[PDB]
């Protein structure tokens, strides 16, 4: 089984214990670690943070302790305008230029592959995405002729039905990608008057309008579109989404007035790292959606939808029963990486729980 873990560049700037550098990553924890967000300048892949070359080096040294560890660099991300990806891919000259610049860059900094994070191709981009994936892979095959181990190619793909039908030709890109990470944790998100969980595993006999917004549906749909199971990777979040209640109501459908207040360390409205949630729980009321199989918590006028060891182990048993290639975890830096916030002096509790299940069978 594969355990793909993302590390984000900007996590280095969080204060105090929130600060996270690649050197805090357990070499034997994941099978693949993806460094988050390289940019594109002059139509060529390029660094993002002023100290990326130093962190690339710090990350790739983990391979000295664990020889089998693979690393990849992800291009794009949320702060990268989709429009920008759209312009690169649309013109063969710009696309070829970007493609030809990747292997050398990757080889220089010691990466084993490229992860594409075009966060949301539109109806007009579908055809160019296919082209980009095909040509990129073809270039990686040619490059391997030089006697060095072929570069890996992966992509982070939306798990939203409408999004999938709009910009992805799954049957086509699946045959060129080594693996596909399903972003099965964005099924709700401060943008509609109510409270709801963003990463439910199951539909939940309760509501019906959105029978599509759960991991189970996303997975079945991909398999139906032609994506081989042995190439699918289910995303498991290590963070939570917070809301500010509009009333004293906490149950399903409770009104919302906006995202929850920022965490002491992540300082981003609507989000909380697992380690900030562990602190949040003291004095909070905990609950669990039976049907969706995920928990949530409330305190004062704050409502949090998150994942704990049990929900995460559950999602992992599930991907196993469906024979998928493995799991993807978004943000090692959002997990209790120091292991000093969540009681048990265990480092990376959420990620470890996933790893344990994957190792049982
Ligand atoms: C990534 O590279 C792009 C393009 O080289 C950067 O964007 C430019 O930033 C300058 C100064 O902020 C602007 O004058 C240009 O108009 C921008 N170009 C585009 C297409 O947006 C960007 O600064 C780089 N990213 C980072 C974080 O370094």
Query: Collapsing DSSP states into helix, strand and coil, what is residue 280?
Result: helix
Number of other residues whose CB lies within 10 A of the CB of residue 36? 22
Between the alpha carbon of residue 71 and those of residues 60, 261, 283, 342, the distances in Å are 7, 34, 40, 28
Taking Cα atoms as reference points, which of 94, 92, 98 lies closest to residue 40?
98
Q: Which of 10, 46, 97 to mutate to test the pocket of ligand 1 (most atoms within 8 A of CB)?
A: 46
Q: Which of 41, 42, 80 to mutate to test the pocket of ligand 1 (most atoms within 8 A of CB)?
A: 41
β-strand pairing of 256-259 with 239-245: antiparallel
- ∠ CA 327-194-284, nearest 5°, is 70
β-strand pairing of 113-117 with 70-76: parallel
Between the alpha carbon of residue 257 and those of residues 132, 198, 219, 223, 245, the distances in Å are 41, 17, 32, 37, 6
Q: What is the resolution of this structure in A?
A: 2.5
**Residue nearest to ligand 1 atom 10, measured at CA:** 41
Residue position matching structure tokens 């070499």: 27
* Torsion angle, alpha carbons of 120, 11, 303, 208, to 10: 20
The CA 42 to ligand 1 mean position distance, Å, reads: 9
The CA 50 to ligand 1 mean position distance, Å, reads: 13
Atom of ligand 1 nearest to the CA of 39: 1
C-alpha 63 chain-centroid distance: 22
- ∠ CA 336-361-321, nearest 5°, is 90
The CA 41 to ligand 1 mean position distance, Å, reads: 7
Alpha-carbon gap, residue 74 to 71, rounded angstroms = 10
Experimental method: X-ray
Length of the chain: 361
Set out the domains of the chain in order of their start, with CATH numbers: 1-238+307-361 (3.20.20.80), 239-306 (3.10.50.10)
- ∠ CA 218-165-99, nearest 5°, is 100
DSSP line for 187-200: S--SSSSB---SS-
Paired tokens of 133:
């994936």
- Adjacent-strand bridge partners of 75: 38, 116
**Residue nearest to ligand 1 atom 17, measured at CA:** 41
Between the alpha carbon of residue 336 and those of residues 49, 105, 297, the distances in Å are 24, 32, 18
Taking Cα atoms as reference points, which of 111, 100, 88, 83 lies closest to residue 40?
88
Query: Collapsing DSSP states into helix, strand and coil, what is residue 353?
Result: helix
């Amino acid at each position: 089984y594969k355990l793909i873990c993302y590390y984000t560049s900007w996590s280095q700037y969080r204060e105090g214990d929130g600060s996270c550098f690649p050197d805090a990553i357990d070499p034997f924890l994941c099978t693949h670690v993806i460094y988050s967000f390289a940019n594109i300048s002059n139509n060529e892949i390029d660094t993002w943070e002023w100290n990326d070359v130093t962190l690339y080096d710090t990350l790739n040294t983990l391979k000295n302790r664990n020889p089998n560890l693979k690393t990849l660099l992800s291009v794009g991300g949320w702060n990268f305008g989709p429009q920008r990806f759209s312009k690169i891919a649309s013109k063969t000259q710009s696309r070829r230029t970007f493609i030809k610049s990747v292997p050398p860059f990757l080889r220089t900094h010691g990466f084993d592959g490229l992860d594409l994070a075009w966060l949301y191709p539109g109806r007009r981009d579908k055809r160019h995405l296919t082209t980009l994936v095909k040509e990129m892979k073809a270039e990686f095959i040619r490059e391997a002729q030089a006697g060095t181990e072929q570069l890996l190619l992966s992509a982070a793909v939306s798990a939203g039905k409408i999004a999938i039908d709009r910009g992805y030709d799954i049957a086509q890109i699946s045959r060129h990608l080594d693996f596909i990470s399903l972003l099965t944790y964005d099924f709700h998100g401060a943008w509609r008057q109510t409270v709801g969980h963003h990463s439910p595993l199951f539909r939940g006999q309760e509501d019906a309008s959105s029978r599509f917004s759960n991991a189970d549906y996303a997975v079945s749909y991909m398999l139906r579109l032609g994506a081989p199971a042995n190439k699918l990777v289910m995303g498991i979040p290590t963070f939570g989404k917070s809301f500010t209640l509009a009333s004293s109501k906490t149950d399903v459908g409770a009104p919302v007035s906006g995202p929850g207040i920022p965490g002491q360390f992540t300082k981003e409205k609507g989000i909380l790292a697992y380690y900030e949630i562990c602190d949040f729980l003291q004095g909070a009321t905990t609950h669990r959606f039976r049907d969706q199989q995920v928990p949530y918590a409330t305190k004062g006028n704050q409502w949090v939808a998150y994942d704990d060891q049990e929900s995460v182990k559950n999602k992992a048993r599930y991907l196993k029963n469906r024979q998928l290639a493995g799991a993807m975890v978004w943000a090692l830096d959002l997990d209790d990486f120091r292991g000093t916030f969540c009681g048990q002096n265990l480092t990376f509790p959420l990620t470890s729980a996933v790893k344990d299940v994957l190792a049982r069978a």
